[PDB]
Structure 1
Amino acid sequence: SHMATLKVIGVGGGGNNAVNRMIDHGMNNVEFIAINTDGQALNLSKAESKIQIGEKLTRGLGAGANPEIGKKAAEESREQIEDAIQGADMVFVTSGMGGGTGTGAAPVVAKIAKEMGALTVGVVTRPFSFEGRKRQTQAAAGVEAMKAAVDTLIVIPNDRLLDIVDKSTPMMEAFKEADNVLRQGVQGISDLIAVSGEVNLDFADVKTIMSNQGSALMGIGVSSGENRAVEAAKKAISSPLLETSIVGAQGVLMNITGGESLSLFEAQEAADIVQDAADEDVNMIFGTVINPELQDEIVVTVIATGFD
C-alpha cells in the first residue's frame, strides 16, 4: 500500500560521476538528480533532472576548489533543489569531499532534503593522500558538515582503493568499486521495499534504523554452497573501502533472501555473525524473503548504525 520514492543526488564532479556510472549500470525505480556548478560536466550527465547551481558566482565553471562558493551556490538555488526533491521519502546524496562544489553544496542539499521530509543518507569520499593535506583538511570539514546535515553518513576514503588494486587496475575500474557501496545500498533498500517478505521489513524499519543515527554501514553479500549463510553474512559486513566498520554497531537491519531451502539454522548462523562482529548488544530488525526462483544462492543485506 505504501511505495517509497528513492532519489539519488550527485553533487559536484565525483558525485555526478557516480550518478552517471550507476545509470549506466541500470538502476530502476530510483530517480537521479545531478547538481553541479560545472556546466561542462553537467552537460554530459545522464540524469533526468539536472540543476546548474551558482551560474552568477562561477559563470558556468566549477568552484575552483573553494567550498564557500559551492555552499553559496547551493543556498541560492534552494528553491530549485526543493522542487527536484519534493515527494522523496529517501534521498542519497553522493559527493567527493575536498573540492569546492561537493564540499560546500552537498551539506546544503542534504539539509534541504531532510527539511523536506526525506530520510537522508550521505555517501561521500575523502581524497587520496597524494592530493595533499589542504584537500584533506577541506574534505574533513565537508565530512563534518555532512554529518550535521544527514540522517546517516557513509565515508569512503579514496586511499582504500589503493588496497584493492594491483599495479595495473584501471582507475575507472577502481572508481566503480567505490560506486558499488552506494549502488548496492540503494538497490538493497529498493528490493526490501519492493518485495513482500515472509518476515516482512519495510521502509518504516529503514527509518527506525537510519533516522538521526550518525555513521552507517550498508552491505550486501551473496553466496552459495556449504556455509553459504556465514559466507554471505561476512561479505555483507566486510568492505575494505569503509571508514566505519561493523564494530560497535548498536542497530542493525538485516534481511536474508533465499529459496525454499533457507534453513532456520543458517539464518541464526548469519545473524550470529553480525551480532558477534558488532561486538555489541545490537538492536536487530530481522527479515526474511523466500524467492523460489533462487536455488542455492542466499543474499544477506545489512544496514548498521548506532556507533557510539
Structure 2
Amino acid sequence: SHMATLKVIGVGGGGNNAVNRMIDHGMNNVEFIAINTDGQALNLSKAESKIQIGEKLTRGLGAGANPEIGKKAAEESREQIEDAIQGADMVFVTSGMGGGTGTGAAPVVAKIAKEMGALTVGVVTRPFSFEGRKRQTQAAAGVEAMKAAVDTLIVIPNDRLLDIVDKSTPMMEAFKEADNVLRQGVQGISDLIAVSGEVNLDFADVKTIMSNQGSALMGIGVSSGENRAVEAAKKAISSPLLETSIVGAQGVLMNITGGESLSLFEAQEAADIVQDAADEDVNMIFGTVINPELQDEIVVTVIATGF
C-alpha cells in the first residue's frame, strides 16, 4: 500500500498569501512550505516549514522586483529547499509572477522539486494590466521559466478577477476565488489518492496525466438534482480565471463521486461533456467513487493536459 505525500510551497508574497489563506481554510494531509526573501512576511506565515532565502542579498527584505536576485536567492538555498521537500511525491508551487522573488525563485524551487523526484505542478498568477507593461513582460519570462521547470503549469491572469467581481467585491474575496483553483485541485487530488474507488484511480494515474505535460487544467464541479452530472462536469471545466481552458485537451483524468444512485448513463453524460468541450479525441482516465453518505450530490473532478 502506497501513501502519497503532497506539499504546497508558497514562493514570494502572493504565494505565501495563498498558503496562509489555504491553511486558514483548513487542509489536511497536505504539508505547507513557505519560501521568501521577505523575513517580515515569513514571520507572519502559518506554514510549519519556513525557508528564508537570500538574506545576504536582500538583508531580509524582498527582492524589489529584481528576478535575478530571487533566482540567486533560491539557488543559494538549494540544500535547505531540498531538505524541506525530501519525501514529497507531489509538490504544488504557487507564486505571483512579475516581481523579483516569485518570478525568480519559483522556477528554481520547481526545478529542485522535480529533481528531488516530486511530481511538480505550478499554479501562478500574471499581474493585472494596471500594474503596467514591464511587470507583465517580467511575469511572462517567469511563466516561461516555470513551464520549463514543472511537470504541469496552471496560469491565472489576475485580469480575470476583474471578470468575476462587482464594483464592491473586496479585493480579499477576489483573491480567495483565485486561491480556490489551487486549493480545490489539491483537495481533489488528495481525495483521489486516499479514497478507494469502484473504478479506482490512484497517484500513479495522476502521474500519468501530469508528468512532463506543460499546460494543464484542474477543476472540480458539484451539482445535484436533474442533470446533475452534466452540470457538475460543466462546472469542473469552467474556467473564468484560467489562461488554459479545456479546449484542445488531449488527455483527461475524470473522477466522478456520487451516492449509490450514481447511474451509468449520467457517467457517460459527464464524460461526453468533457470530450465535447475539449473538441479533441481525448485519452480519458476514468474513475468512479461511490460515497453512500452522499444523497443527491455528484462531484466531478477533472485534470486535463495534452495541449
Q: Give 3-state SS (helix, strand or coil) of 2:173's partner.
A: helix
Q: Give 3-state SS (helix, strand or coil) of 2:9's partner.
A: strand
Separation in 1 of the partners of 2:166 and 2:196?
41
Q: Give 3-state SS (helix, strand or coil) of 2:84's partner.
A: helix
Deviation at 1:239, TM superposition (A): 1.8
Q: Give 3-state SS (helix, strand or coil) of 1:91's partner.
A: strand
Runs of 4+ in 1 over 3 A off after TM superposition: none
Q: Give 3-state SS (helix, strand or coil) of 1:148's partner.
A: helix
Deviation at 1:66, TM superposition (A): 0.2
Separation in 1 of the partners of 2:250 and 2:112?
28
C-alpha distance after superposition, 1:29-53 (max 9, x if no partner): 0000000000011110000000000
Q: Give 3-state SS (helix, strand or coil) of 1:249's partner.
A: coil
Separation in 2 of the partners of 1:239 and 1:179?
13
Deviation at 1:287, TM superposition (A): 0.1
Q: Does 1:198 align with 2:198?
A: yes
Structure 1 counterpart of 2:21? 21
C-alpha distance after superposition, 1:181-209 (max 9, x if no partner): 00000000000011000000000000000
C-alpha distance after superposition, 1:39-71 (max 9, x if no partner): 011110000000000000000000000000000
Separation in 2 of the partners of 1:15 and 1:61?
16
Q: Give 3-state SS (helix, strand or coil) of 1:234's partner.
A: helix
TM-score (norm 2): 1.00
Deviation at 1:260, TM superposition (A): 0.2
Deviation at 1:75, TM superposition (A): 0.1
Separation in 1 of the partners of 2:137 and 2:109?
21
Deviation at 1:152, TM superposition (A): 0.3
Q: Does 1:84 align with 2:84?
A: yes
Deviation at 1:173, TM superposition (A): 0.2
Separation in 2 of the partners of 1:110 and 1:257?
31
Q: Give 3-state SS (helix, strand or coil) of 1:162's partner.
A: helix
Separation in 1 of the partners of 2:64 and 2:286?
46
Q: Give 3-state SS (helix, strand or coil) of 1:45's partner.
A: coil
Separation in 1 of the partners of 2:52 and 2:222?
39
After TM superposition, list the pairs within 5 Å mapping 1:33-48 onto structure 2: 33-48=33-48
Structure 1 counterpart of 2:301? 301
TM-score (norm 1): 1.00
Separation in 2 of the partners of 1:254 and 1:70?
37
Separation in 1 of the partners of 2:141 and 2:228?
41
C-alpha distance after superposition, 1:207-242 (max 9, x if no partner): 000000000000000000000000000000012000
Structure 1 counterpart of 2:151? 151
* Contiguous gaps of at least 5 residues in structure 1: none
Deviation at 1:266, TM superposition (A): 0.2
C-alpha distance after superposition, 1:93-127 (max 9, x if no partner): 00000000000000000000000000000000000
Structure 2 counterpart of 1:208? 208
Separation in 1 of the partners of 2:182 and 2:64?
26
Separation in 2 of the partners of 1:283 and 1:117?
25
C-alpha distance after superposition, 1:247-275 (max 9, x if no partner): 00011000000000000000000000001
Separation in 2 of the partners of 1:245 and 1:294?
29
Q: Does 1:124 align with 2:127?
A: no
Deviation at 1:279, TM superposition (A): 0.1
Structure 2 counterpart of 1:273? 273
